[PDB]
Amino acid sequence: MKSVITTVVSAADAAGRFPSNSDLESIQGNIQRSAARLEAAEKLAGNHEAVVKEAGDACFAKYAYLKNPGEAGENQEKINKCYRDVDHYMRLVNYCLVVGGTGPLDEWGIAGAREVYRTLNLPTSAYVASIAYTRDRLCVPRDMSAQAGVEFSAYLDYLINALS
């Protein structure tokens, strides 16, 4: 997992040295910003089955052709596999808000994703349209605080640039 802790340890393990004053100075930033990204995480955790319903409808709104006979949303057992795979991505954003870095999105959502979606004829632009809808349906003091939305919409922008 890419985090604040695993970055300064691996930078010192590869050099063979002890945790110095600059390595402890960056864990202080894990304390000054844990408050904002953890109440962005429990807001997402308590209201996740309502968000992935609203997000997964935005890919079947723009790309309505997927329910035609032949495409990836052809029958019913393939439609809930899209809502399952969007709930996978919202669950991994909750993990990156807990850990403090893009680790659970890298190791579990992004690495090997483009090889899988190309082999199974899944368009990556509709795993994106459900994510980009969640990013601009976010109001600044209503859904969370000011700095909780900066953190939450930065892991959504990370997944958008990684699928494109």
Partner: protein, 248 residues
């Protein structure tokens, strides 16, 4: 004023037979009869209340407003009698905020969304001088209610094409939803409240859920941001023969 969705992709609006029955001196109206009557009352109950799913022991308190409606055949007086009921204030006034009550009066009684903060603040100017009955009778006795619905038809959500602001079409699409959608799902909490007072707009997926069948519900979204930047000054140049002219 052409409006490519209205009688094409939706249905036709329901209502009474004509408005010439009031000038008839041996009747009051084309008398519908109690199969042609109560299916119009089903459409007033589905429109003033949302899909509230009112029970048999809640319709018994609305017994008096229908018994007047099947003699005096005015639809506007039936809508006025249902908005002063207990069953209208226990759903839309009792556990809601003030701009949630105001934004549902525009849905239930006009079929549109409020266009302004200045139009919205004048409805709270009528709350101070007569309570909630001063808001309701001023909507009903307005000029906008007279030249769209009148005494004849139910107040339906009308796709006009020639809206006086483009934002008025957006707030109408957020307010109505699909047909499997009532208006108790938020815990109070007016949906249009941030966008009226700031001046921004709505979210594209929330509007395209409420569009009809056959109107490209959702496509057109680029995968970048959904709104506009007011501070951006782009360079848009026109080709002339010699070079490119930036008439800015």
């Amino acid at each position: 004023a052409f409006s490519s969705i209205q009688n094409v992709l939706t249905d036709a609006p329901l209502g009474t037979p004509s408005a010439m029955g009031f000038l008839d001196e041996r009747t009051e109206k084309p008398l519908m009869g109690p199969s042609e009557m109560d299916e119009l009352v089903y459409a007033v109950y589905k429109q003033v209340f949302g899909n509230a799913h009112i029970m048999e022991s809640e319709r018994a308190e609305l017994r008096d407003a229908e018994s007047l409606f099947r003699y005096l055949r005015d639809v506007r007086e039936f809508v006025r009698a249902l908005a002063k009921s207990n069953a209208y204030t226990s759903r839309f006034l009792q556990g809601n905020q003030q701009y949630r009550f105001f934004e549902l009066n525009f849905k239930h009684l006009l079929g549109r969304g409020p266009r302004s903060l200045e139009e919205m603040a004048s409805h709270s100017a009528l709350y101070a001088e007569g309570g909630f009955e001063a808001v309701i009778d001023a909507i009903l006795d307005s000029d906008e209610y007279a030249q769209e619905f009148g005494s004849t038809v139910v107040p339906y959500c009308r796709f006009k094409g020639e809206y006086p602001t483009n934002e008025e079409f957006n707030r109408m699409l957020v307010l109505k939803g699909a047909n499997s959608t009532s208006d108790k799902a938020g815990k109070g909490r007016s949906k249009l409240c941030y966008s009226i007072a700031a001046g921004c707009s709505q979210n594209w997926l929330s509007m395209s859920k409420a569009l009809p069948f056959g109107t490209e519900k959702g496509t057109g979204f680029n995968l970048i941001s959904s709104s506009r930047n007011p501070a951006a000054r782009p360079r848009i140049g026109t080709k002339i023969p010699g070079g490119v002219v930036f008439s800015s």
